[PDB]
Symmetry: D2
Subunit: 315 residues, 4 copies
Amino acid sequence: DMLTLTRYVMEKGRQAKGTGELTQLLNSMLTAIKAISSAVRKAGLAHLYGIAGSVKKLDVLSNSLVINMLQSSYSTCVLVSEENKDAIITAKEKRGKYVVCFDPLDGSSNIDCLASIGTIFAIYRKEPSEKDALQCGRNIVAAGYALYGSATLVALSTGQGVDLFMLDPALGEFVLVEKDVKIKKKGKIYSLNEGYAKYFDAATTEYVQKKKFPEDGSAPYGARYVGSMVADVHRTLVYGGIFLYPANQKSPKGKLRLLYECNPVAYIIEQAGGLATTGTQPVLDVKPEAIHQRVPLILGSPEDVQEYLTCVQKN
Amino acid sequence: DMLTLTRYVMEKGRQAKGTGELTQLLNSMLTAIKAISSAVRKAGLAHLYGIAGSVKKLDVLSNSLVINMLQSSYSTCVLVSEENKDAIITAKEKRGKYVVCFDPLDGSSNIDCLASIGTIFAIYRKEPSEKDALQCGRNIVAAGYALYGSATLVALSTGQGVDLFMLDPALGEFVLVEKDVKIKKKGKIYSLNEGYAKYFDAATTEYVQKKKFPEDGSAPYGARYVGSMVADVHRTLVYGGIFLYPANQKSPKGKLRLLYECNPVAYIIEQAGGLATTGTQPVLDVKPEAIHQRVPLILGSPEDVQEYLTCVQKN
Amino acid sequence: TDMLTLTRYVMEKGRQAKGTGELTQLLNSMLTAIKAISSAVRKAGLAHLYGIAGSVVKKLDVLSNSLVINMLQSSYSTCVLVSEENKDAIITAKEKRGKYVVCFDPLDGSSNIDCLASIGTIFAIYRKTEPSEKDALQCGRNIVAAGYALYGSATLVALSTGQGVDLFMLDPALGEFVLVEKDVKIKKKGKIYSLNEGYAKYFDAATTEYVQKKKFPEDGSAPYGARYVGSMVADVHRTLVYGGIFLYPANQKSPKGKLRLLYECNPVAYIIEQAGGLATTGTQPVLDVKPEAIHQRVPLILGSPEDVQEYLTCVQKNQA
Amino acid sequence: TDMLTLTRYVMEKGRQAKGTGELTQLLNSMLTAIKAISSAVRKAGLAHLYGIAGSVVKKLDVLSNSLVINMLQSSYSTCVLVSEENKDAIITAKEKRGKYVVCFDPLDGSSNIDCLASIGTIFAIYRKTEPSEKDALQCGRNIVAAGYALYGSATLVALSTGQGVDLFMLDPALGEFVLVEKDVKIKKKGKIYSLNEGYAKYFDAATTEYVQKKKFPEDGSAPYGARYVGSMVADVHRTLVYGGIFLYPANQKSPKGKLRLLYECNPVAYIIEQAGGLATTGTQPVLDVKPEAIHQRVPLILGSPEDVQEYLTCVQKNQA
Ligand SMILES: Nc1ncnc2c1ncn2[C@@H]1O[C@H](COP(=O)(O)O)[C@@H](O)[C@H]1O
Ligand SMILES: Nc1ncnc2c1ncn2[C@@H]1O[C@H](COP(=O)(O)O)[C@@H](O)[C@H]1O
Ligand SMILES: Nc1ncnc2c1ncn2[C@@H]1O[C@H](COP(=O)(O)O)[C@@H](O)[C@H]1O
Ligand SMILES: Nc1ncnc2c1ncn2[C@@H]1O[C@H](COP(=O)(O)O)[C@@H](O)[C@H]1O
């Protein structure tokens, strides 16, 4: 009923009988995301190219947008960013009770070819230190992502399923476009970098073979891989299927990051009725041991993820 | 020096000692592209969702934008659109000498997952009929594409190499960001739907094997496939490598369309020093026989395309 | 504060007031309608009306009204709305009913749309006292919050919830209002006077005497400058930020004034008073007028207190 | 025509004139600077100044000036520029030199930025007669093209290249100016008069007599309405589209007028004349004044011809 993400989030906080602290935190995150979308679409580019006579930065700017909007919310005590070596402890004067792990601009190596890129975040309730960010994903309070693709979208869950919002740039607000989205039980797309096939384990090799060469008279799955995690994960949510960045010979711990990439999208996919696993346990059950820890990631439609796990247990 | 695409195109027409007719045509195309970018990013979405009490269309709108901007230019006599069964003959009162083939919104099945999508066009100099659009790609006067990705970009050539422009949404104009772009002689990315491997020919199977399992001590290529042709072709241009939608058992004539998909991107890639082939001849040398003809498409860095052709000739 | 955006700022003020979140949702709703109106006023989508895809004022009035009514009703915070555009009060559907009453002019500055002059949106919010138009007939002393949006060279909102006036500017690249001045105070005395002197023939003696003294001062000072955009929000906002006086007094052709008490004069009188200025009908504060009908007119004289005092002095002298 | 956008329209007019494309490139350049200025006036990027990423008027003047100067110089169409913001004429670098001279006010309406009133950009283009400021001292009769942008509730450009006045509105969703009225003609007689009556004490007899007749007509008609935004582009544009009269005459404190001949009065006089109106100093057409210095001031009275005639009549009578 509420139409805009601002009114929707407020109304959900009123229903939760919250003090307004998490609401201010979500308000601040979403404001950072609007500022990042504006910069990603290249507002102001002409000034860069000398229109007024004056002729990686996006990484730094997006990081600064999130850090400053979150710290000034008075809702946080600890932040972990993909862009910072150490946890960032909120100034005592501005301390609230939430911990936020985020990748402010994910996929951002691919800005050069203008691929879809995004922002990922997970929020936890907490003397503050990096240990406060080492909670397993089962403890998530809220999480979500922004996708800067053909349009700008946010996926958000606070524990009651997944809602989708799209940014209307004429209005400057996110509009609710889908409530309580559920992933297909089984899809027909598989998504991984097959350029690593030389380094796969046996299970992964066998699983990919079954997708391309089925034995049960079914059509082979179609393949997609943007190489931008938010884009591939969002397509998996809305179309169904499976997304994988498993461990391989060259990346034995996996490549994607547990705190601010894997846990947030695992939380979204599970809230949507999907599964997300390292191949040996659910991602949300991994007890994090360091803030920039890598883990393997396999997620999507539950029947597809289940077939993958069945290959793993075989081999 | 000219900074904006409008001034650049005008200055190029002055240098060509043109009558202004092709310039008005390019002006009209670019205006259509700005209108499409605005709609693709979802300006006005909130009005759709009832903000004022009033609660495939993008395909139709983009088609109408291009057709109306081109016809009203007074520069055209024949249009071919991906969206129309028959060629569209310009009203005699508005007739000029150019023929335009275009796909007004390509990749547009993928709007639902917000994948990058685009607009592709090729322009020919011409009693007008569909036969006027059946010229081989060697006859192209100008061609290019718009990519609606993390930002909006245009690639444009009028026969003197490829220039890249980016839309600054704060200014409302395209800004020149790269002049005379040249593709790498050899890249390290291969791009195709391996979900069709069951249906590949021997050459394609062998080529993909060599990318994943090289014999000369080199690292395997990385794999990318957005499944949106403009996005994959633009990444091939700026990063190098190879893009393929070859014929297969299920699509024996190929899938992509010669007039308004394959010829325009072949023209751009060759202008940039790359190669584009059906696997039996250069795309730009194919003599079109029908306006919605399909052809196989293999293009990108010349050494990569050459390795592919060497596999084809082998098998 | 540190809140930076209007959204965080309004939320935080609601937290401090220990509200239930109902007035916050109402204010969020109004401000969303104001952003939608700004977009339309600046003519987003004009090219489509002029046939870019092959298909070629009252418009904008109706649209702006529909934006405000729908955003307010769907907030679940309202029971009664009064609009400049509707003859009767609009009663909120019972299942959406909350406790607030909103009086608004969704797009003020009619004489000016066609020449692109600055125009605006004006509103005042009351708490209800079964709902009916009588809930909107409260004197301005009962205002809970009030404000205006100015669609000028940039889009600005002035808002007060009873602790002074704060000014916010819309950053169109961000899509949000940014706090640019907190607790603004009007100058004690200005140097601009603002009224339509084309009604000179119809003025009362007091107005004639006051205007004459602005042009031909008796104290050795320079005459005041004159400005009159003819769009009340633009003139009142300049009065707020530069000081001076704005007037649309009663005259022979408009013996009760021209401007509307509920949704033009009360809201701006509240803003001006909250900023340390004065707002009078000429005989009493605008905020003390007891409304008798929802489209009632009243005379309006407002701005810097020394200036409004000099005008009231002309009134009492000429009335004695 | 059918051209729809300002870009196609200007290109097509250049094709019809059989130009080399040099004036077209100059006009494209000016219009790009105007879009960049509109974006900045509406405060794109404000949130970044206020610290959204941790980093917290004269500004806008300098920016707008730099936008116009760089876009014009890089067109390769110019040899001499005169700006309201620069003491001396600006000579184009020899390797960028073309044949046109441009006089402009990059951001007119200073008294109004802070209160967000409508403001604008004004320009006039001449063909050169080695380049120096003398190439800018041509009377307005030699104008090749002239125009203004109004940053009001929406952004509008008025442009004439000598075949009447066309009006274009910026669609900010598209990023282009759209033709909204071709060959606009001012009313023969209006019902609005526009001047700063705060200078009444300093007026000449003619101005005093004229203003008195607007408020107290002698012919049984209703008095004229008054409007005065105090930003010349806004007042002149309203005069164009609603009719009536706009004045900033000489007065005792400004005996040669206040507004600037080269880049305020000549351009708008050209626009007004092209639309069938009159523009006078009070003693001769503005376009006939032979400029003697690049920041020369002149009195300006312009608008509907019957109104300007009634003002000129007051002048001749009171001068006899
Ligand atoms: N806007 C919201 N949406 C959903 N849940 C919320 C919201 N605000 C608060 N909650 C829930 O209530 C708890 C307490 O909120 P808070 O008092 O603001 O820290 C949160 O940790 C959430 O579980
Ligand atoms: N803006 C332009 N950029 C590059 N080449 C152009 C341009 N305008 C015209 N030409 C070239 O000159 C030819 C004649 O132009 P036209 O007289 O406008 O039909 C074209 O077919 C192009 O080869
Ligand atoms: N966001 C706010 N800003 C200022 N005052 C507020 C706010 N929200 C609530 N209040 C005050 O608290 C009262 C009750 O709030 P509510 O429970 O939301 O109706 C209001 O009528 C205001 O006086
Ligand atoms: N785009 C245009 N619109 C109207 N008149 C033009 C245009 N371009 C050129 N002209 C006229 O033709 C003359 C010579 O043009 P140019 O060769 O571009 O300097 C100009 O000084 C104008 O009088």
